[PDB]
């Protein structure tokens, strides 16, 4: 409990060090805003865009040309500004669906990351998942994904089967290891000495299939009680 809590504290320090040293890592969060503004910018730019007209503003063409020689041009102006708007809103919808899927994803993130833990291996953050902590944003959300990444792998000795009195045995949960003048049983995914009883072996088949395997004795956990 305590040392993992402290290593989480170190993870906290890493969080702050990264974030203070990464204030721009919000690019993926901020770009969309530009696009919007950029889209806005584009629409503003098309206020200046002629679209085939002698100008691009209503007031100057209205004042210069009296309507009886300008109504059709005014109407074409209307149509061009329209078509600009429908185009713009069409990209607006495209991005709208983009963020739509993104935030469907986001709700899923908070469900399987905040409201629970996702078994999915690369959904709630890189690698194996523990937890996720959300935070607001100007227009989005941030997930501090707290994940597991192994290290420091060193060799020890296990066995595929145990030929006990000619009976093939296989580990239930955990593997054999030897740390020096001593053999014990640990877990599959990590190293820890564990209670050596019959519980760690189950019989299925014989040891005649692999030739030359060793013969081993499994003590009854009740004989020391019997004596």
């Amino acid at each position: 409990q305590k040392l993992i809590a402290n290593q989480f504290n170190s993870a906290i320090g890493k969080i702050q060090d990264s974030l203070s040293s990464t204030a721009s890592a919000l690019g993926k969060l901020q770009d969309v805003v530009n696009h919007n503004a950029q889209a806005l910018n584009t629409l503003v730019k098309q206020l200046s865009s002629k679209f085939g007209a002698i100008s691009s503003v209503l007031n100057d063409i209205f004042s210069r040309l009296d309507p009886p020689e300008a109504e059709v041009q005014i109407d074409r102006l209307i149509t061009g500004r329209l078509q600009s708007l429908q185009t713009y809103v069409t990209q607006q919808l495209i991005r709208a669906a983009e963020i739509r899927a993104s935030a469907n994803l986001a709700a899923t993130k908070m469900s399987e990351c905040v409201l629970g833990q996702s078994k999915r291996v690369d959904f709630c953050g890189k690698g194996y998942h523990l937890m996720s902590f959300p935070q607001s944003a100007p227009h989005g959300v941030v997930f501090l994904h707290v994940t597991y990444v192994p290290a420091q792998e060193k060799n020890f000795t296990t066995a595929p089967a145990i030929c006990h009195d000619g009976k093939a045995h296989f580990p239930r949960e955990g593997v054999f290891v030897s740390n020096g003048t001593h053999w014990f049983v640990t877990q599959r995914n990590f190293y820890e000495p564990q209670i050596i009883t019959t519980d760690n072996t189950f019989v299925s088949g014989n040891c005649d299939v692999v030739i030359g395997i060793v013969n081993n004795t499994v003590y009854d956990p009740l004989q020391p009680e019997l004596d």
Partner: protein
């Protein structure tokens, strides 16, 4: 400066290095860039450290530690 020819075209102003480095600016058609420190080198994008993982049969390598890492999504 030196002119290199890659599948994407003609890279001028880049001193084409042949060495393996991690990619920073992908230039194209499988080639990336780096800063010489001075000049800008271009090379075939060093794919990575070819970690030839050792298959094992009757011995294992327990991960004795790890990192509770944190990422920003």
């Amino acid at each position: 400066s030196n002119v290199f020819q890659t599948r994407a075209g003609c890279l001028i102003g880049a001193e084409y290095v042949n060495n393996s480095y991690e990619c920073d600016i992908p230039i194209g058609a499988g080639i990336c860039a780096s800063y010489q420190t001075q000049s800008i080198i271009a090379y075939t994008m060093s794919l990575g450290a070819e970690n030839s993982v050792a298959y094992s049969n009757n011995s294992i390598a327990i991960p004795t530690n790890f990192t509770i890492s944190v990422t920003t999504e």
